[PDB]
Amino acid sequence: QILKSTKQPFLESQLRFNQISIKDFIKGLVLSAPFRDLNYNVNNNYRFVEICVQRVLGRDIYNEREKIAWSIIIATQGLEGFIDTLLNTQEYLSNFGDSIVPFQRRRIIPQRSKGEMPFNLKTPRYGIEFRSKLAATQFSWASPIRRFRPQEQQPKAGDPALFLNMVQEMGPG
Amino acid sequence: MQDAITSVINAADVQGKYLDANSVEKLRGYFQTGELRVRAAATIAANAATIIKEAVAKSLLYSDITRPGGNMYTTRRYAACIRDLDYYLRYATYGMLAGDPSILDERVLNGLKETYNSLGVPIGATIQAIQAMKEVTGSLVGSDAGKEMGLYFDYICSGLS
Amino acid sequence: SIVTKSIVNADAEARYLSPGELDRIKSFVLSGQRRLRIAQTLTENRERIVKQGGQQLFQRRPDVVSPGGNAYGEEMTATCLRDLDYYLRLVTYGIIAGDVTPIEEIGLVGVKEMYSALGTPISGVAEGIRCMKDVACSLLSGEDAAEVGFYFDYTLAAMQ
């Protein structure tokens, strides 16, 4: 979702001129319109807490009751009070402060070869719940271009069109 | 009408012996692919109408069996096709789950080529429709699952020939 | 036709044809001179009856021809008018057969399976035949327009 339809060129301008901090840049990307259209509108209140704990706080959900406990902040205060409460936890301010971009904290053990399945792959933008209302399909009905006569673009095996162009050499050499 | 387990039990029973290591060796091979066949039969059930719409438009929808005089001209005759192609995509799904093509010749193949000759249905265009239908089925279920579902399509095409 | 199903009716009942059946085969063949004139009018008016037929069809259903519609582009629109030429032809058969028996087993039996399986809106093709009906009945007198229109609306009924 890093498209220039989703770039925030005025949040970027206020970060270059030292007006906002990175904590305000991270807040402005969650409250942005591309994040509400592509992510918030295809999750329920419980899976969206799992997305914003994994990407803002940098760690995984402890258990299925941490999801329940935080999803009522979105339902009663809206999305703007939920990301103020998350950014003002001491878990955030001890790790990233207001000047560091978040990351997935302690994903891989120092001597091992594998990791812990990075969080953009563990939770994509919709899941099993919401996936059914808005997944895509395979072969819908849309009346496409008919490609016209269509075998013939892959000639069928006996047939003398595979040697066309090889007739070509034939003359001189 | 035997699946892979029924065929394994029959051959092990027909000699009156128990299920030795070789009989269970194939049964373990069938249970390993049990997860693949259901998901293959899952998506085929979902895209049944879409697969048949793709096959006819890719094989015999652009032709002169479709035009007047061709074998598929009238709307009753056209409607019989997608009804007819539905069985091939459906019974092939059953063979893919059962892991044994016994159901095809039991319920599809016998009296089939002898029936199309009676009606005058072109067996040549029929097999190419199933071949094109086999080609789109490998699109959905993947490569190896398409290899499994494709293994029963040409079984129909072979016997129907 | 009226001759073939008045037979197969009395065929099934193990009997011959009644006066009610034979005074109508009689009444139909004396009607045969007037039927060929009516079908002769629609025969060499297919250029206008079809092209003006698809005239009102697109003005009333621009979705089917708009981008995304089933009959979109130079290709499908040609086939979009091809089916109307088919159904206009079957109405000429029904007028000469004195019944929708030719239209029944051609273009009507299982028609919803075809058009549903082609992605075509079956309601849209029904709108096309209605537009052809107003052009056809505008080409004939009142005594004839009660027939030529009469076979179209049967096709409208079975096509939905």
Partner: peptide, 22 residues
């Protein structure tokens, strides 16, 4: 056997044969 029915001879149709260029 009906108002539309098939006979082999009236079939003028490259579909029993399959030269796909027509």
């Amino acid at each position: 056997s009906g108002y539309g029915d098939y006979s082999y001879s009236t079939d003028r149709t490259k579909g029993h044969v399959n030269q796909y260029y027509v």
